[PDB]
């Protein structure tokens, strides 16, 4: 059993609002008409609960509804035709990007555009102008990464390990989720601290772990759809090796990346007591996400 | 004197655009038209000759925007560093609300000042040469530059001095170097994919190049910044933290500069192979960072600003 190797030298936590938030995410998905096929156990609110465990219910609900939105958007890209049609996806992302800027939805817009607009409207009530910009960009880059994956599928091109790993950092909107840690913990990190190279390298490390963990768990389902945007499948193509060896290599990178994150957590320079207090809350927020992603995915029927 | 020149060397060469002089004369004409020129050596500014060195392969239309942009930063910085607005957070937030609005595409009004009109002209001209995604990335780096200037204003107003770690982290934005680095894409006419543009090794090369440029400037600009009682300078910050002599601080400042050049060269060889086309485009961008490192050094020793 190779899944037992997805381990960390730290533990996670879950919000006491977990179930109340998850049932509210289902009501939210139903309201904006995101529920279509079949849908008893999605439990997208139970991932948010683990990801932002100290968050007040109102903020955790936005995060939960946001995580839900991403899963609905991802399933469309990876298991339907739009993920092989760039023209359709460009037309869709033009509407999303307009909604991110604060444009009101119109009669011709789809359910996902309406849903994103509500999340943007709600984030606007709880986040300052400077935060929305940083969120917009990370989400804008998330769309760009999906258009890139769409082109690869449409042109039948598989990227090398170097290219995939670089693109995979944006293709999961992990940086956009890490932004919500600021609102969840209610911290105002100053520009110099927020964008410091060590914080970036901690974010990059945390992002890789989360994504490479998911790649090990979701390779079977992505393989059946012929979607090779997966560390295991990209490694297999590059090294022309067996699937067990490809999994073994992916887990070696995961293990090495956990070590890097732990090593680099101690390399944060001292700015002042107040700023460093806020940073450890954010860096704790990263660790919560690392665990939240692994804890949920092993129990979730999605990778069964 | 020679001790400085031997420690401000780089293992790579710079270059200058053949359009240098007409671009500089046009920048002086542009500045005068928008009323950015103060009554006082107006021909001995040469803001165009920095741009020419910074973006040497750029077409004349593109280089001119960059030259007018560099001129704009210089006029703006002199306000924050050598006038009363840099000791008043209230007036600066009011001004910075107008700039950020102009960057979002807002038309200037009657009550707006010269710099607001000048920035609106640059955004309009950049909108004709750069796509939507580029303008966003430029706006952010310029927005963070404004925030960094507001943070210095607070430090001056309270009479507080940051430690080496705080200054070095904040100095990366106070220069608007990332905003200047964005123009390399338009200058070299390259389309770097998201994954290559925002890659960690590329980010490390940028902040390495940013540190070299800013720490080089600090070594040459501590005399005139000391006169205004401003300790936003690696030399003066190291002196404050260590409580050492001014020669010792300069030595420590040039040590960091020297090791950062060594880092940049080491990081340059660590860029992974994506594909022929992307690596070629990225090769042109990283060369652009080397041109900027030399441009800042070559110009500042040449210029009258630091004398
Ligand atoms: C899915 C998504 C964009 C957001 C919600 C899921 C979250 C927040 C999990 C963290 C790891 C990420 C971002 C991978 C999902 S993309 P994938 O195509 O690998 O997803 P899959 O393996 O099908 O679950
Ligand atoms: C004016 C400006 C922000 C940019 C022009 C110079 C450029 C583009 C080079 C990169 C390093 C910078 C910007 C430092 C000057 S800020 P400072 O207050 O230290 O300025 P000074 O040293 O007095 O020239
Ligand atoms: Mg996907
Ligand atoms: Mg998927
Ligand atoms: Mg997956
Ligand atoms: Mg300054
Ligand atoms: Mg100055
Ligand atoms: Mg200086």
Swiss-Prot record, chain B:
A motif (DDXXD motif) lies at residues 77-81. Pfam families: Terpene_syn_C_2 (PF19086). It catalyses: (2E,6E)-farnesyl diphosphate + H2O = (+)-T-muurolol + diphosphate. Gene3D superfamilies: Farnesyl Diphosphate Synthase. It is an enzyme of class 4 (lyase). GO terms for biological process: terpenoid biosynthetic process. The record marks 175 as: Plays a critical role for abstraction of the pyrophosphate group. Disulfide bonds: none annotated. Mg(2+) 1 binds at residues 77, 81. Binds 3 Mg(2+) ions per subunit. Mg(2+) 2 binds at residue 81. One of its GO terms (molecular function) is terpene synthase activity. SUPFAM superfamilies: Terpenoid synthases (SSF48576). Its EC number is 4.2.3.98. Mg(2+) 3 binds at residues 217, 221, 225. Substrate binds at residues 171, 224, 305-306. Pathway: Secondary metabolite biosynthesis; terpenoid biosynthesis. Catalyzes the conversion of (2E,6E)-farnesyl diphosphate (FPP) into (+)-T-muurolol via a 1,10-cyclization, which requires isomerization of FPP to nerolidyl diphosphate (NPP) and then abstraction of the pyrophosphate from intermediate NPP leading to a (E,Z)-germacradienyl (helminthogermacradienyl) cation. Belongs to the terpene synthase family. This is (+)-T-muurolol synthase ((2E,6E)-farnesyl diphosphate cyclizing). It comes from Roseiflexus castenholzii (strain DSM 13941 / HLO8). The lineage of its organism: Bacteria, Bacillati, Chloroflexota, Chloroflexia, Chloroflexales.
């Amino acid at each position: 059993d190779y899944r037992a190797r997805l381990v960390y030298p730290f533990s996670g936590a879950i919000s006491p609002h977990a179930d109340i938030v998850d049932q509210a995410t289902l009501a939210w998905a139903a309201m904006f008409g995101l529920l279509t096929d079949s849908s008893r156990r999605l439990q997208y609110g139970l991932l948010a609960a683990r990801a932002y465990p100290r968050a007040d219910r109102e903020m955790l609900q936005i995060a939960a509804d946001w995580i839900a939105w991403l899963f609905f958007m991802d399933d469309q890209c990876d298991e339907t035709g739009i993920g092989r049609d760039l023209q359709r996806m460009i037309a869709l992302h033009e509407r999303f990007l307009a909604i991110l800027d604060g444009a009101t939805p119109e009669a011709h817009d789809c359910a996902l555009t309406y849903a994103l607009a509500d999340l943007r409207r709600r984030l606007a009530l709880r986040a300052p102008d400077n935060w929305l910009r940083r969120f917009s960009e990370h989400v804008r880059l998330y769309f760009t990464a999906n258009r890139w994956e769409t082109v690869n599928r449409q042109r039948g091109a598989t990227p090398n390990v170097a290219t995939y790993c670089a693109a995979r950092l944006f293709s999961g909107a992990v940086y956009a989720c890490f932004d919500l840690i600021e609102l969840a913990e209610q911290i105002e990190l100053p520009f110099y601290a927020r964008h410091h190279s060590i914080v970036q390298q901690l974010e990059q490390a945390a992002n890789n772990i989360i994504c490479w963990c998911n790649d090990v768990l979701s390779y079977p389902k992505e393989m059946q759809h012929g979607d090779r945007h997966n560390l295991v499948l990209v490694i297999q193509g590059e090294h022309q090796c067996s699937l067990p060896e490809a999994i073994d290599r992916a887990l070696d990178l995961h293990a090495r990346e956990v070590a890097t994150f732990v090593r680099k957590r101690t390399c944060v320079p001292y700015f002042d007591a107040a700023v460093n207090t806020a940073l450890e809350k954010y860096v704790t927020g990263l660790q919560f996400w690392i665990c939240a992603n692994r804890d949920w995915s092993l129990t979730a029927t999605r990778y069964a």
